[PDB]
Amino acid sequence: LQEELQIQAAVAAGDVHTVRKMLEQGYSPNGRDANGWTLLHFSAARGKERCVRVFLEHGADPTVKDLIGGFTALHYAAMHGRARIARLMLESEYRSDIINAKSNDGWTPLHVAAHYGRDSFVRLLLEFKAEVDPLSDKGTTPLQLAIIRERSSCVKILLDHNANIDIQNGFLLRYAVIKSNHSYCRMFLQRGADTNLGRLEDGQTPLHLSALRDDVLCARMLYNYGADTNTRNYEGQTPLAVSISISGSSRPCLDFLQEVTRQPRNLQDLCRIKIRQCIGLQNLKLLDELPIAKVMKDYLKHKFD
């Protein structure tokens, strides 16, 4: 009763010299409090890196899930951006058992790090080759957590590690349009997000919602990157039909949608679409390896838009 209370205080104070003393004399590092927390949970949550290292050296199991979420010590490190503590645990013999461990509700460490915008910790996990798009129990990937807390830098890092920009059939473009985040919309387009995917509940496309919110800048960016003007949702409306459920004309969004839903677009862009579809919207650096002129390829990448 004294020893567990004393080793705890040594950790909370950062008295690591004591912690190593008690471990040498047989004190096991693997008991649990009433929340299932181990000394590695406590040490990680409180940022005590030196305590963390020596606990590992004496057999402390970092795979243990707490009784209040099924969270591991590495989850709580992910929460507070404790990269160094995490790097110790990932260098241990348990790396592959902890790196993608899921909480009760399906959140991995990468889910937690992306949600809190912990850049370093995100690079950490990708450095040790964490899966980039594990699925939560609701189907949610880490990028989506990053997206909805608007952790732009973690968004840029995950997309750079090939996170699926088209998760749940274009939800990132959906998010940009719903929020009118035009920076996000442009960035996801320049990175090759497919504009012709309908959400599986109501079949709406990004162009559809760029009309529900009469956002002409979104509508235009989507069309300019090749959103299809006659795709129809689950209730049969084209994107222009959506703007007609509000009708009343006199607004640049339906004025633009009218001008593009009737006149079929150029053959120069229709060939851009098929070439980019043939080459693959997430493999568009293969265009630098093509036999064309800079101007032609510039047009292909939508560079000067």
Binding site: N35, W37, A45, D66, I68, G69, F71, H75, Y76, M79, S103, D105, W107, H111, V112, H115, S136, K138, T140, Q144, L145, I148, R149, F171, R174, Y175, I178, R199, E201, L209
Partner: peptide, 23 residues
């Protein structure tokens, strides 16, 4: 969109549960 609402419910739950140890 109700799409966002559930996602935000999920991130609510993530925050609640991570922070529960001191609640």
């Amino acid at each position: 969109r109700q799409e966002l609402e559930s996602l935000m419910k999920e991130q609510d739950l993530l925050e609640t549960k991570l922070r529960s140890y001191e609640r």
